[PDB]
Paper text:
We find that reconstituting the pentameric ligand-gated ion channel (pLGIC), Erwinia ligand-gated ion channel (ELIC), in different nanodiscs produces distinct structures by cryo-EM. ELIC is one of a few pLGICs for which there is an activated, open-channel structure, and is therefore a useful structural model. Activation and opening of the channel involves a tilting of the top of M2 away from the pore axis and partial loss of the helix, such that 16′ and 9′ turn away from the pore. In the extracellular domain (ECD), ELIC activation is characterized by a counter-clockwise rotation of the ECD relative to the TMD.
We previously reported structures of ELIC in MSP1E3D1 nanodiscs with 2:1:1 lipid in the absence and presence of agonist which are resting and agonist-bound non-conducting conformations, respectively, as well as a structure of a non-desensitizing mutant, ELIC5 (P254G/C300S/V261Y/G319F/I320F), which is a putative open-channel conformation. To assess the impact of nanodiscs on the ELIC5 open-channel structure, we obtained a structure of ELIC5 with agonist in spNW15 (spNW15ELIC5) at an overall resolution of 3.4 Å. The pore-lining residues of the transmembrane helix M2, 16′ (F247) and 9′ (L240), in apo-MSP1E3D1ELIC and apo-spMSP1D1ELIC form hydrophobic constrictions consistent with a resting non-conducting conformation, while the MSP1E3D1ELIC5 and spNW15ELIC5 pores are open.
Author numbering:
A (entry chain C), B (entry chain D), C (entry chain E), D (entry chain A), E (entry chain B): 11 to 320
Write the structure that this text describes.
Amino acid sequence: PVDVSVSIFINKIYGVNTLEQTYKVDGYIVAQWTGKPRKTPGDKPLIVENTQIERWINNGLWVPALEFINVVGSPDTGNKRLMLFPDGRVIYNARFLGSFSNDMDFRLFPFDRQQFVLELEPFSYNNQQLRFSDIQVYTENIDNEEIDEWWIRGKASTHISDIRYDHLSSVQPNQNEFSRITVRIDAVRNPSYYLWSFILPLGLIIAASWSVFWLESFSERLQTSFTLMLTVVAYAFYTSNILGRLPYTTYIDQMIIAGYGSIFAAILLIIFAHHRQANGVEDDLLIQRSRLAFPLGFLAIGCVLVIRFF
Amino acid sequence: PVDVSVSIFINKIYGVNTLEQTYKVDGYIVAQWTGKPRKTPGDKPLIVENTQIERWINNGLWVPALEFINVVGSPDTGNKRLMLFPDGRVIYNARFLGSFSNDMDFRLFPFDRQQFVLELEPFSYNNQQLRFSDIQVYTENIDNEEIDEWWIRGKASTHISDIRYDHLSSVQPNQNEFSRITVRIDAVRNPSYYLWSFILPLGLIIAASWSVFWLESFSERLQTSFTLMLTVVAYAFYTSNILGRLPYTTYIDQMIIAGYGSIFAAILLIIFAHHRQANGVEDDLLIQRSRLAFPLGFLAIGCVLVIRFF
Amino acid sequence: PVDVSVSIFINKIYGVNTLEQTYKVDGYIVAQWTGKPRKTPGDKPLIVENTQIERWINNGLWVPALEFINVVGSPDTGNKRLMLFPDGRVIYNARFLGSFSNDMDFRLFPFDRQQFVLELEPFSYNNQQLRFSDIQVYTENIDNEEIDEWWIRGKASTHISDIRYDHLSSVQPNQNEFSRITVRIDAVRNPSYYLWSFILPLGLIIAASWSVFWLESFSERLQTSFTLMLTVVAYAFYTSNILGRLPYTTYIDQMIIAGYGSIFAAILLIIFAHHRQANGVEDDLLIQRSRLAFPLGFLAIGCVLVIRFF
Amino acid sequence: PVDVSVSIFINKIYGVNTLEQTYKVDGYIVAQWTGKPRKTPGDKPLIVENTQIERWINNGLWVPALEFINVVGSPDTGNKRLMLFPDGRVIYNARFLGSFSNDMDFRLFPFDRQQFVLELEPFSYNNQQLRFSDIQVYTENIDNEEIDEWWIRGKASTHISDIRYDHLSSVQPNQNEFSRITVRIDAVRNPSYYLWSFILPLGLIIAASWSVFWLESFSERLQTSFTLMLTVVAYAFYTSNILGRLPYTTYIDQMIIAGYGSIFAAILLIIFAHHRQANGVEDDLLIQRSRLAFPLGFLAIGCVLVIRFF
Amino acid sequence: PVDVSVSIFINKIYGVNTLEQTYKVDGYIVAQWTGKPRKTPGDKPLIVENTQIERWINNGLWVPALEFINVVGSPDTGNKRLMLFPDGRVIYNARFLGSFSNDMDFRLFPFDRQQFVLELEPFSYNNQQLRFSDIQVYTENIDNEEIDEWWIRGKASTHISDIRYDHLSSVQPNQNEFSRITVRIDAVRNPSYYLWSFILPLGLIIAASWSVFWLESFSERLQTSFTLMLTVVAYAFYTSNILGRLPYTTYIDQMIIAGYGSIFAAILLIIFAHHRQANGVEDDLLIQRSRLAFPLGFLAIGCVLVIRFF
């Protein structure tokens, strides 16, 4: 095996698409190994630009191709460079722009915490012929920044592991484990936009539907509330435009369902007050005092989940 | 004919688009055959990376190109590798990322069960010159997982068949049958999102329109119901954003049409109660008792289909 | 001139986009001609795969490039093959996936009948140097199937014609006519989706607005109708999401305009009934009997067009 | 300088996107010049197909590359051909499919008149080394046709000019002027779709809001009008889906603002009638006679602009 | 080090997408350096077109590749040219079309002022082997123009700096600083479209909700206002279609929240007037005089921010 030392410099992270849980990473990858000594023009290292490395690979140079495991599509490699030293070490530098994908858990949607994962692996050479010594990730450009709505908290975590592939076991008897490099970058979602953009209008709608119980007109108790019901019902697919069609429920959908329950319970409660109007003149005060208990009890509904969920 | 043994390793399945019934498959394909013995450096097998296989094909090596039949666009082949053995066998390993298409039947839309199909076939060599011995599909990464909203149930089914092509009969007299490999992966749709996102709000709207019959105001019987009618009418094209413009009707559209029938029948029933108001003071109770029968009978409508359909 | 015999096998037709009147065709194209006899390894025909045909073209082989005239973008050629025979005939087989475009007439939109047209033509060689003997279209995979919402009725029609190009007349004096091959595949749109998805809800809305004339409350005559007016007005741009911004009107837009006329005429009729209320107590029955004539006469409006249009 | 004679044949014009003011042009470009006499096989001209011209350029042939100035992205050149004559003249024929961009003035949006502009220019050779003798544009396929919603009126105008580039002045002292070819194709927008799709529904809404002044119920004067106000307000961003976010106002937006002014003036007028109800029983007729003047005066508003604008 | 003189000519700037803060730049880049003297055909400089420069790079010519740092994806280089002089200087001219990205601050959204930034840098050669002498930016085509909705004010600013890269420090001991060129083009957003398209309709809605306090009907005080509330609530996500999901609030969102506060305060104020109706006949005038103070005080709310923000 030959040891390869990697250095990944993340230029920027952009285009975090939560619909299909893919993000876009731009950066540079440096892979340095050692070989037989060679002669170079002068004592300076020889620099081979793009569309000239293939001329050296044709002549017999050994340049492994390191692929990205969790990519979507293909990584768009731009300029690439090969630095050959007189002492006999080779440096393969390249620029990559890849749409990577990682599994995300959007339970706590407004207050989420995810991680962007970069997986690097040789395509053909296993650990018997290629090993990863170490990786230093230089996340200086996005160390503590906000990209679109995600804060990058802390540094990046690096891991070197061995992955056993069983589909190559029929062609390689006992050498089918490949060295894999994992780079994890923690990100925390910014809840401010949803706080002033959906939390406040939904809370205002819910408070307006709370304040409909004080009216002395029955038709205006029912029509305005119903309206508010129908608007909150129309607010159902807000999360499905941002995220995907998730099986679980998020905080925003939980408060939407809570608004459904509260407003429909108010509708059924005033209809049950009309049920209790046997003579049509009877007025309720103990069950219509919900004017005071309705808002508080609903408030409790959300906080309970809030605590249980975080 | 020369026998080719295939091994397809599905890295991940993502991007299941039901509008045009295409999904995206990432993975590795290994095709192993045997030939004349050759000399290699040392006793180890010789590994030929990408943009170096063509140099061997130019010199006279026999590397068939296996295409994907049911692809949309072209498969995006990334890194590719050729392993030549001293005993005289050749292994062609490649990474494919293809947008494949399969026919889907969205009758039971929330509780669907489809299959993802991968079809592999030589482009030029028929079964007289190329045969598929066996395929082992290594679906270990997606064995029992949820990808976006589809559960992968069970293992993958493999089939090797012969497809007779009639367009090559005018150029090949009696050898126009090609060996085809089919990989079927069963998937079951997760009904949870539609259960809490569309089933519950539509049921709440329908129950609210059921509870409008108890009012003692005629204008408020009609205006609120009509509203609920117009919202359920506005809920018509929900399925056409997820799936295509299907000729048949799904469960969601069936309950939407059932809501149309129930709510419009309530509208026509209260209008017919006003028809029976010859003196304008007559009140109905046998036909206005639908307050009790209306909800139940409607409930029956859906269950009947539910049973007949599953 | 040298005669070229073509065989086009349509693998599948998908992605029929009516916004820009383009569809996507996948298939195989076989072009067979004859030349000088040559020597091949053994007596079997020699098969030349992709990225190896150019080596033969460099050495002096004559392989014409047949382009697609009505394509949008460029056809995505995948694998390609060249079969050379010892008797001296050449077969050029290729796989094409092209976004083709044809003019469509969406007058009868729900009950349309279009045709998918494939035009094939040599790029450089005219009929003095290249002629098309015959084309057999093998439409076996889509013979009688439904693709997305189009039924393929009957077989495919083939035509071989000569197209005179005037832009090459300044460089070629009397030889500027190119042989063109046209393949026409008839398709009929399935009206079922629009029948249960837009025909029925619009008919229900129109019937509900018909049934508003029986009310004994004037404000509830006007507000509900107006609403129904405003919803039918909001249903104007349904056709523009499916098709383009057509200059003519389709069946769906014709019934939308008919709903405009009927509902606005009902609005103006009840307002004119209020006009006739000089003392405010006068009630009309001859012009308010429209309760019976209104629905029928409107029904007549559509059928008349229906017959005139089909 | 060497004179180059151009012939541009427009196959079709499609995909006119007014959001970013780009259209798509498919066609053929022929560039003919003369050089030293050469020997060809026989007396017929020699035809060099695609991926074979570069072999002649390597050997020393002079083939200039003519770029398109106003393109978006890069032009997708398909098949290309080089015709070499025994008398010593070279013809470069190519097929281009380019997304071109031109500045458009959407003041009169429904009744617009734009022009599609194709700009062709040598990339490197100035007028001291390359001149354009003449261009004949063969717009026979789209001479008098409708493409999507644009009529092509008249023929195409051709112009040959010299463009002085100042960024090449630091590297070329007195030779930095390049020969440019401009092709202008006049197009007139079809106003029919907007006439039956937005002009008529907006006019119907405005007429319905005109006819609300005849009611003898004050609450029904206000609620229905307000509704109509809110719908016309919701019709604000119709132009921004077709065109971009223009700084000026179009005819459709001008009539939308006119509907705002008319309907809000009716709202403020009936509220001012309630202002004049000091005793609550006073009824106005001179200022409430707007029933007659309101519709006419509004009609005048639009026509005035109509005339001033065209 | 060898000095390289750059000249960037911006052909056009288009496609300013504020959702992901990327724009598209088309233009030409000229890089001129000097080397050893060489012999050319005649005394004229030798011009090497595209797909011929690589033949010179193979033979030993030194052509550095200058990349764009802030690009998204990869720059689409079209035609490229190499001008070699007899005195021994090399000019590399190229055409670039790149999707560049810059950080934007959408606080003052309708009255914004941003800058488009182009960053150019050698891929491999540091300042010890490649230096940038000067750059002249020829922004003559977009000097004082409006592109889509942005005015280009003033000229372009050029800067040459040194960027220290730490990821190359492990492979280069003390030479890891690269010469970088920054081009800044100031742009000012045109507020006219938002002035006539969203400022005026929102102001009209707010004024209509101001004018609801003058009614002598309580149900019509509440229902119309509520409606206006619900429409202004529905106007929440207007900014999120133009820009992204920003954490801060813009002017349009600030006035939307101000409309929320004003209209909901009017709703709570008329409900509190009903609270003060202990006998149900009491009418307020000091707190219901808001008819005069309500509009003015709200007006003040916006202006205060306006001044504090600009």
